[PDB]
């Protein structure tokens, strides 16, 4: 019985936005600057954020500290994880593509080499 | 400057699925007459009660709320806000709809009724 919402996937994602611009239980802040979030939502998206909050050894925090990434590059992906929409100029893509790898977001990797090499 | 992933809310809804799947992160226990884990954020999202009651501060920050509702038509619509699929049969149909109501979900609602008065 499948009475599919192809819409509801996104209507959920578009409200998970609205949450986190209203600051509504946002658990966590990344620093890179100060980008509040839901662990919930960056771990769906990112290899690396579910490798770490999943980690039962780890200490569960509010705070999580980010070694040089770069903080534009960041906020990109971030708006992409709850947007699906990844903004990329010449002037920053070199700043988001390096932050995916990192993030681990394989399917961001890919995107940021076809635009590098065009054009 | 705005390329969308077409299967990403998609993904991070069955990434969101699966961590209800293995009991990741969820924070809130619906107890419906049986229990039910989920995440504030995700009930929210799809649920205007849901969303009332989790903003309220006198019932923040709590974890358990209990809601009489149909369990089996609860598990239904649990199933739908982390999937899209609404799974629908004559001997729950009734009891969806309701629940349905009830959280004031209403793209659901009409796909119940149409099915009712589809096949009689």
Redesign the interface.
Known sequence: ??????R??????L??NR?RSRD??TDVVIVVEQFRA????L???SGLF?SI??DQLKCNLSVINLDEINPEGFCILLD??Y???????EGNIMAVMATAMYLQME?VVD?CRK?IKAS
């Not at 019985?1 to 192809?6: D, E, N």
């Not at 947007?83 to 100029?89: A, D, G, K, P």
């Open positions: 019985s499948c009475i599919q919402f192809t509801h996937a996104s209507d959920v994602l409200n998970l949450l509504i239980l839901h662990k919930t939502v771990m769906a998206c579910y909050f999943t992409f994880m947007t699906s929409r990844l903004n990329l100029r399917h995107t635009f």
